[PDB]
Amino acid sequence: HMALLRGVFVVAAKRTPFGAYGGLLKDFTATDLSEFAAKAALSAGKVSPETVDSVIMGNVLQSSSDAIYLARHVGLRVGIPKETPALTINRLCGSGFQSIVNGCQEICVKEAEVVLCGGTESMSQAPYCVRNVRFGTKLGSDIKLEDSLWVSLTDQHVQLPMAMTAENLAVKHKISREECDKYALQSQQRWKAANDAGYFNDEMAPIEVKKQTMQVDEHARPQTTLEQLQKLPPVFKKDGTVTAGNASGVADGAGAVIIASEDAVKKHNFTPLARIVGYFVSGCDPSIMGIGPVPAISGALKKAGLSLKDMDLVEVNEAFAPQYLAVERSLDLDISKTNVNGGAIALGHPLGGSGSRITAHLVHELRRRGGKYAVGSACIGGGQGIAVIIQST
Amino acid sequence: GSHMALLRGVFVVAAKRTPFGAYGGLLKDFTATDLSEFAAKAALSAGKVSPETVDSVIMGNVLQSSSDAIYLARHVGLRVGIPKETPALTINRLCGSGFQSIVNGCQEICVKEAEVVLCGGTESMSQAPYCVRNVRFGTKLGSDIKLEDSLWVSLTDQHVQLPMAMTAENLAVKHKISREECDKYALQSQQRWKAANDAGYFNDEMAPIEVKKQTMQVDEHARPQTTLEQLQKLPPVFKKDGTVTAGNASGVADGAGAVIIASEDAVKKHNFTPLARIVGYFVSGCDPSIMGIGPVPAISGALKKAGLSLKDMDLVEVNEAFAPQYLAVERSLDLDISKTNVNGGAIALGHPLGGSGSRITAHLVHELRRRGGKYAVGSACIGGGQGIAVIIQST
Ligand SMILES: CC(C)(COP(=O)(O)OP(=O)(O)OC[C@H]1O[C@@H](n2cnc3c(N)ncnc32)[C@H](O)[C@@H]1OP(=O)(O)O)[C@@H](O)C(=O)NCCC(=O)NCCS
Numbered sequence A: 001h002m003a004l005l006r007g008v009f010v011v012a013a014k015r016t017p018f019g020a021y022g023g024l025l026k027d028f029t030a031t032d033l034s035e036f037a038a039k040a041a042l043s044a045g046k047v048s049p050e051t052v053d054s055v056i057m058g059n060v061l062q063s064s065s066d067a068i069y070l071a072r073h074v075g076l077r078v079g080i081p082k083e084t085p086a087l088t089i090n091r092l093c094g095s096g097f098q099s100i101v102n103g104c105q106e107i108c109v110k111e112a113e114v115v116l117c118g119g120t121e122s123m124s125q126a127p128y129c130v131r132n133v134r135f136g137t138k139l140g141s142d143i144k145l146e147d148s149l150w151v152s153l154t155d156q157h158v159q160l161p162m163a164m165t166a167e168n169l170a171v172k173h174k175i176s177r178e179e180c181d182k183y184a185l186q187s188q189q190r191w192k193a194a195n196d197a198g199y200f201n202d203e204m205a206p207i208e209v210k211k212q213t214m215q216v217d218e219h220a221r222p223q224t225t226l227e228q229l230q231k232l233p234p235v236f237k238k239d240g241t242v243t244a245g246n247a248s249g250v251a252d253g254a255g256a257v258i259i260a261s262e263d264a265v266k267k268h269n270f271t272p273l274a275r276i277v278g279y280f281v282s283g284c285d286p287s288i289m290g291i292g293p294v295p296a297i298s299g300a301l302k303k304a305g306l307s308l309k310d311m312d313l314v315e316v317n318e319a320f321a322p323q324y325l326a327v328e329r330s331l332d333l334d335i336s337k338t339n340v341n342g343g344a345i346a347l348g349h350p351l352g353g354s355g356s357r358i359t360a361h362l363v364h365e366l367r368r369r370g371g372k373y374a375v376g377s378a379c380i381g382g383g384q385g386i387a388v389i390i391q392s393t
Numbered sequence B: 001g002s003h004m005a006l007l008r009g010v011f012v013v014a015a016k017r018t019p020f021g022a023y024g025g026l027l028k029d030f031t032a033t034d035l036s037e038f039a040a041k042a043a044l045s046a047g048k049v050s051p052e053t054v055d056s057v058i059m060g061n062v063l064q065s066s067s068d069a070i071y072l073a074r075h076v077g078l079r080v081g082i083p084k085e086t087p088a089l090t091i092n093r094l095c096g097s098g099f100q101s102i103v104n105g106c107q108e109i110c111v112k113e114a115e116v117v118l119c120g121g122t123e124s125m126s127q128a129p130y131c132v133r134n135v136r137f138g139t140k141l142g143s144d145i146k147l148e149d150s151l152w153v154s155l156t157d158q159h160v161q162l163p164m165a166m167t168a169e170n171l172a173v174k175h176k177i178s179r180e181e182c183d184k185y186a187l188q189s190q191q192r193w194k195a196a197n198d199a200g201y202f203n204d205e206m207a208p209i210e211v212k213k214q215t216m217q218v219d220e221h222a223r224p225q226t227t228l229e230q231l232q233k234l235p236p237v238f239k240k241d242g243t244v245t246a247g248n249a250s251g252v253a254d255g256a257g258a259v260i261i262a263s264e265d266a267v268k269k270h271n272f273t274p275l276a277r278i279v280g281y282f283v284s285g286c287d288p289s290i291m292g293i294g295p296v297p298a299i300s301g302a303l304k305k306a307g308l309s310l311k312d313m314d315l316v317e318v319n320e321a322f323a324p325q326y327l328a329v330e331r332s333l334d335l336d337i338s339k340t341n342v343n344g345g346a347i348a349l350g351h352p353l354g355g356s357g358s359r360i361t362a363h364l365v366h367e368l369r370r371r372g373g374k375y376a377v378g379s380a381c382i383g384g385g386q387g388i389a390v391i392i393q394s395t
């Protein structure tokens, strides 16, 4: 058991609607999206920007001309003082959780009292890259306009597409194509029900788009049927389980979670929505990277002195239906408490943004349900997992 | 109060850095991942640190410059034999990144989430791609689509619309630093690099790399035949009558470093040989328009936390992003020039964005020990308006 050195409280948690690839948010940079979530979080928590001592943003694939400045530009844009530092981190799909981890660490070593911890991705803006042309070409060479997004979805250390790591898990854990499609349908249904009941209202940071207000996830396909899913072809493997219907969507979006020490909550009269009770990051076999949430969630629980049975809500990012199902079977997760309002298959997976959304959703949904504990997690390309546990306040 | 010690003792048990390659030079075919791997392997070997003891891998890298870049820290960890269970994080605090990975490592150690951390920094600027934007979803007849130079556009801070060099010209104006004073500093960096290199002062830190076969173990960008008269003839690159030229700005370069840090408990458990102890560090924001001043609040804050003063520093390093930028820092803190950037810096050997902080730390670790000194502080300005500083103590 290892408790955080200091109490750390979530005092605001907001996330943008998620846009489809080439959809309604395609002309916003990852920096813009992060800005929108951060502004909404500051406003929802009534957190003065002046109070923020550190800015940390998760972002995976640099996708704008100003990308290397992301965290700093977000901080300055939302009125946080110029003296406040700003860090951009990349733990791939875990990035939106990892910014919160880094924030907790800075608070716990007394280097910060209030941290803006976001995650963002614009996958629509991922550039094509022309490599190896600065210093001359050779007649007859095959120069590519390389799709930075598509090539980033293969782990070159094991030469596997992400989807093929998920197929590896389907084989290993005896998960059928049909089971994957049924899970995919359930994510669409659960997203639809949640959306229509208002369960995304508190977390949602609406964005004005070219003028209309976007406040609904664009990728979701609430008219999906099992029959439709059954007809889709496997995309990556003959007779494979992974289709365009049961993989997470490519998407654009961001979130922002503001965390504060107990001292800061008292000093500034913040309203805590949750407490961060623990977290854990683990490496795992890159060839089955999708299993990361298993050691991540187990380790986090162990450090917190809790068990799975104590979790009222579990979130496992829906990178691929078979990937999620392998995690579910390995931990014996209770499906009535896991991804209760849908996930990335329905609303997409903006790489750096998903951890922030999942955390924001857990914070508000845990409170709505009157529950005590929740844990959010994601697998990470390259072979890692991350998990963050919250407790209601 | 202002004083603050690290929660746990954190020791440097290895510190290595690659030779730095020129833009389009000897290391141009190595990815930032490859370069980091070479530094990390060398550090593991020099510290006799078994890869199995490493609990976390943290790498600074600024501009993604290879098709595998988003995986960089993880690939480095796996390539050097660190267990698959060990996590891996890539961070970007721009030019401060190579210091920042060490800061993150210190934090993880101090909250007992790690005992031994591989903290590196790397950049391949030679590999920065051209980017084609806005063509996924159709084009419009008559639009002006660019093969955008990702490196060049990244050297302008779009929040204030200033090239990095122009923020340095802002400092030259503000602090009354002349073109001639800048060129004299630049000459001194070349001279100091040359003397250090020839005396063997980079030997302990150096992680040689086999290139196309020869062993590269000397910084490629350095121009030891530089004279003041040569520098005087160069034109200002960014501003009419400006101070900044190609001769007194840091070079574009490729290179990496690796610093392995360990808790006191790990040093004792594994019988590591500490080279230094991390005493303190600090990161501050500052005005983006004069981002080059970042080392001033960063160094001041770190010293304040550590209960030390500038007079206690046997060595000071301020990354030489631009001569006028460095000189504005020197004048603001009244640095002792006989103890500051003593063996040259980025004007001579170049500035691989993510790699410089790792090299500076590594150099301080070995040079402090060589001098028999007690304390050193390394620092860098950070595009966007930040600064970072790390203070070490000899063991
Ligand atoms: C699988 C993948 C390649 C598909 O991308 P895509 O082809 O642009 O996806 P689309 O939305 O265009 O769907 C393609 C087809 O499936 C159909 N389809 C998808 N979902 C459907 C649904 N729920 N119901 C009915 N049809 C559906 C689409 O309508 C389309 O058919 P059509 O062109 O005949 O109309 C992409 O989503 C992917 O790789 N996602 C995972 C990203 C990832 O790896 N992230 C990191 C995780 S670690």
Ligand SMILES: CC(C)(COP(=O)(O)OP(=O)(O)OC[C@H]1O[C@@H](n2cnc3c(N)ncnc32)[C@H](O)[C@@H]1OP(=O)(O)O)[C@@H](O)C(=O)NCCC(=O)NCCS
Binding pocket: B095, B155, B164, B165, B223, B226, B227, B230, B231, B234, B237, B245, B246, B247, B248, B249, B250, B251, B252, B321, B322, B351, B383
């Ligand atoms: C200044 C800068 C644009 C110059 O790029 P560059 O012109 O390709 O650099 P070079 O090495 O080719 O030097 C250009 C010219 O100056 C000359 N030069 C440079 N240093 C010289 C020296 N020490 N003595 C004599 N000539 C020198 C070169 O010989 C060359 O002349 P040439 O055209 O006759 O061959 C580039 O180095 C830069 O932008 N550096 C800073 C990058 C940065 O901002 N990093 C982040 C810091 S915050």
